[PDB]
């Protein structure tokens, strides 16, 4: 893989690109996953946890996954990148600059994700790289979760 | 508890405050909780899951919780508000405009949260309010999670 040093600022900035990575592997968001997240988080809203009622009453025709559940299931998905950042002492998940849930993930559907570097800035503590992560229902062109992840290189 | 009508934008805008609500109840972020989130999300980084290696090699001297784990545990924390928004048909968790993890939650520590309304805007769909949510280790003045929630009253 191409190697980019966090010390070579102008090289880090070249990674800013509008084209997304290839797709990642696929993960099934089962009702069992949804129910476990509901108990772990405390969010047991019926549109996520009540299949019988959601079939009859939900705008979506079935239960759907929590937005924040799909967000954290990104760690099940390996995004293939053709490059590798090096020459940092440490790498940190600094949070996010944007979280959106444009479309729902129906219970039982698979998700996959792709990404691109949306911005690169030098901060006091190092280099902040913003990676736009899009998580989709497999076969759905509109994202279900958008996450402008902020990575801090130190 | 006062009632603010989503049809009265001057009354909605008057919720904007630099001061936070009272504290919520407390919740224990045990190693068992951290381990389960590791399995559910797929994030098994040793700083969260490996006490022994953490004791000797972790910059924190022990395991800590995933930032996104503390984030989703907000649904365990009931924030007492002195008001209630009404006169809407639907409320939507539209996402977030800022997520940060300023300080870590050591395994076995308790957390609690408070919040304030950061901004209120009229939108085509209805009224957008940004609520700053702060989740802390009980007794720590620095937040462990900052989450600027975006709420859409339709
Ligand atoms: Cl590239
Ligand atoms: Cl920042």
Residue numbers in the entry:
A (entry chain A), B (entry chain B): 159 to 312
Report text from the authors:
Shy contains a MaoC domain and a DUF35 domain, the latter which is responsible for interaction with Sal.
The crystal structure of ShyMaoC was determined to 2.05 Å resolution by molecular replacement using a protomeric model of the protein as predicted by ColabFold as the search model. Although the crystal was grown in the presence of acetyl CoA, electron density for the ligand was not observed in the structure. ShyMaoC crystallizes with two chains in the asymmetric unit; these protomers superimpose closely with an r.m.sd of 0.3 Å. ShyMaoC adopts a hot dog fold, with a central bent five-stranded antiparallel β-sheet (topology 2, −5, 6, −7, 4) “bun” wrapping around a central helix “sausage”, inserted between β2 and β3. The two ShyMaoC protomers interact to form a homodimer with an interface area of 1001.9 Å2 (as determined by proteins, interfaces, structures and assemblies, PISA).
